Amino acid sequence: GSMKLYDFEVGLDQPFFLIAGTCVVESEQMTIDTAGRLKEICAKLNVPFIYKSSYMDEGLRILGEVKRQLGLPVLTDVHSIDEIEQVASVVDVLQTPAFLCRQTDFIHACARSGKPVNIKKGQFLAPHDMKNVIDKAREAAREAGLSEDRFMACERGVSFGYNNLVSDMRSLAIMRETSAPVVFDATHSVQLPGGQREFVPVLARAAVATGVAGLFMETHPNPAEAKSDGPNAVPLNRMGALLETLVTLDQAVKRHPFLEND
Amino acid sequence: SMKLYDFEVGLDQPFFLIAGTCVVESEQMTIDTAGRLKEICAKLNVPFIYKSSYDMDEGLRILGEVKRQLGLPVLTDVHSIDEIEQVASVVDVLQTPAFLCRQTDFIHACARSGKPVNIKKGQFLAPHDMKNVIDKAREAAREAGLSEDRFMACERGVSFGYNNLVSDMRSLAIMRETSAPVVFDATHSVQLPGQREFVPVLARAAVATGVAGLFMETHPNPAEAKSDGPNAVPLNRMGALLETLVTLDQAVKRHPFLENDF
Amino acid sequence: GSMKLYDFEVGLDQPFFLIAGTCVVESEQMTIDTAGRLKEICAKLNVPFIYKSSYDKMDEGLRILGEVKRQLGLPVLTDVHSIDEIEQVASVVDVLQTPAFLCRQTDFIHACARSGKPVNIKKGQFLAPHDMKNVIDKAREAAREAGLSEDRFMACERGVSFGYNNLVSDMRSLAIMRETSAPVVFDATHSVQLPGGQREFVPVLARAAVATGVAGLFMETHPNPAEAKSDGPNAVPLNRMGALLETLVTLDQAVKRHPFLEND
Amino acid sequence: SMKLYDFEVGLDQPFFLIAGTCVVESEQMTIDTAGRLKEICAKLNVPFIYKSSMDEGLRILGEVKRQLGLPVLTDVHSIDEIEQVASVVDVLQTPAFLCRQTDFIHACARSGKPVNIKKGQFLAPHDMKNVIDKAREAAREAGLSEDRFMACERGVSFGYNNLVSDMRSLAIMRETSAPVVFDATHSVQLPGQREFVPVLARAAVATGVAGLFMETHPNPAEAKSDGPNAVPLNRMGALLETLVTLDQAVKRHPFLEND
């Protein structure tokens, strides 16, 4: 399942794309500044790039400005059914909170919004459960007269005892049965339910070698203020270096079929 | 940056492979399969340690023939203090069952054996718990007049509910604090306390995370290697898998790991 | 921690109350019969009883619940799944109950909190026990903001994720959630769930939970035990409810006769 | 069901208590504390096995056994200790991590003494049947009776640095046809939790078990909430009175789950 997203193609058989945004809220002008830096970093490496909003009316307006000034596709989380219409009018991709993955009214209202949807897998789900979630979203899309190839399955961690998430790299393989692009959320997969930014690169490298369609990471736009006890965000001035590694990994594992298929 | 016979191993070296079979074969076939593995690894310049399929006196004789005929370093599991002399008198590297990782009498008998030891992390340990295991093992070696840089720390999964292990890639980075080479066991990490499909998945993830070494079992009879069989890569696919893994390992070791700078 | 719940008071210092409903939908007439049978089973043992709707997984379901109330006088609880359902179920039901996975969906929980009805708030299987305090405190602020009293919430244990497709019931949670200052309810039916087939553990966990010390207990019952197999819903056969409840009464009395030692 | 020292133990019997101290005492105060536990348990008719808090430890355990006429239990840690330990004690106990180390479990099996086999924190409850079935094969091949083993729940790993007590395990392990023992002190321990010992004890006894292990703190003056996972000695009577009431309640009639 390799689908169209904005003006590029995404999927397990395509070069990985990045979703990134900031771990702090900036002024309008600085939000554009940071988005522009990310655009340039990704452009030089040829990594397809979707900008994610740092946060409602005002947040959406600024996202609209990012889209218009920088020609970027943008993505935001939607939190309730009542928000969908307003958000989907502005953004190119909706993203659902993990804990709502089985709130069928909500997921289906997103599915019929007219925009593609990055569906986060609840931390209480087994990887096989995503197939049901995607199948029912597709049925909602069909019934609204919309194409079915408009969903991604997003791994964000599974509950591991109390106050911890583990990233089971097996999930990234299993969710290929959804026939939907698999997206790895590196920032939320390290979060204790900040202080874990050291594991963002670790998990990103592991996930990209596992084989995914896309990756989400938050970035810290003020490396001067970016500390190990802060958000689980990669400093902006190190993003280039990490992406170069991830491109090499992505190319390596997609040069030939994954053995586990073969 | 540990010396291990003919080569050096470590996070700062190319990864080494420990591999042996998921089935016991006749003596002649055992030598045959060890030979094939030696050549596969030779063509790719992957340092190779052979693991015994017998882990009794008969199995040690056959392992003796493997070493004499092929010159391979040999690794074996040992299960009790008595097996150490019986074995450490024939093999080059000892390996300890994960469930015995805090059985200090046994781990310290291995530490004083005169052979290097790959010490498996218990499925009930947290990654930070390995430092104390290695530190006490090094103490034992020192008290016996042996050098301290003779231990590896081996990740083999952590318990995840009932009848399931999960491979937390964070552990591979955390155990770097042991100043011991970290080894990833891909075959036992997938096991349900029928999962061969996850062996290449976890090997790629672990190699991209950054390890000193990797353990995988191989199936020597690919005509009879099935999905519901052992958690083993068919011998005829090992070369292709190792080529992927070499590419990933070289890629992540080209520069310092980003997480070091956090 | 005590709380008025219509005709009775509930709390760690009161006799436990039961929430029970069927695990299958029955005809209108068997629905009424079954509700009367449960009423009687509980009446004979003096177990305060709240009837749970079988129709909550519409207007018909609500009509029938209306007949249950009008005919039998039972207080009625229902799961609600969206903000819209709150107003829809208002004329019939007495107690709202929230899906576990919505425990942090603030718009939804605060709508429940403002409904005018008390609410049994299920703890998500992704939460740790200490997390429930903030959930309850948020619900109370919403209640306050709407001119409603704050002593109208209960905290319901329904298990926590344990690897894949498995829930474990950490009895420590039932003690820890006392810090919410709200009655703690144990859901013995969804706590055995394998995210049916686990009905053998419903009495096990109900006994354990009541001996741990709770305000309330939710169990489903099966009205047609002869159809009720080991592979079916996680429900106590209706003809065994009396015997189980007599055991649970005895446990509840034993553990509340004196202070809980963990409080010393 | 089976005979243990002087008495019958099992799901169809009044629960027995295994208890020992959370701190090593002097010989005389070890004796006094075992004495006080003995009296507490006798007043309530609770069958009581004392667990030791190597030569010297076994010497003192032998004095407890003899002077107070108590059965005694201790952990064995290697095959090499078995013969020395079994000549002194009435019940062997195996560390949970060793539950699959079959040469070691089977040596305990042939020892001639009964064995309380701890379920490792890495095992699923169904896994104990194979462990116990093999122990029994080892007993039989040695000419000993097969009804000399107990399955002991001590927690299962729950993420990192935490154990959870799945009360389902206590019912599932009934399939072993061996008495199930609940370890309330080790089931709370983080791989400062004494407040959960009474919680888990009440829960396990209501679930239905043959036996219960708890540590007690013999110096309640020094016994703190940040201290061991141990019930102060002066509160054991009150706790045991509650537990007996629960044990009688759930054993009065068959367990509903037995359908």
Author numbering:
A (entry chain C): -1 to 53, 69 to 206, 214 to 282
B (entry chain B): 0 to 54, 69 to 206, 215 to 283
C (entry chain A): -1 to 55, 69 to 206, 214 to 282
D (entry chain D): 0 to 52, 69 to 206, 215 to 282
Task: Quote the paper.
Here we report a functional and structural genomics effort that applied saturation-level transposon mutagenesis and next generation sequencing (Tn-seq) to identify essential genes in B. thailandensis, followed by high-throughput structure determination. We used an “ortholog rescue” approach to maximize structural coverage of these gene families, which are likely to be essential not only in B. thailandensis, but also in related, but more virulent, Burkholderia species, such as B. pseudomallei. Of these 56 targets, 25 satisfied criteria for being a potential antimicrobial drug target.
For the seven pairs of ortholog structures (with no bound ligand) solved in this study, the average overall Cα RMSD was 1.5±0.5 Å, indicating a high degree of structural similarity. This structural similarity suggests that the ortholog approach is an efficient method to obtain useable structures from otherwise intractable targets, thereby lowering the barrier to structure-based drug design targeting infectious organisms.
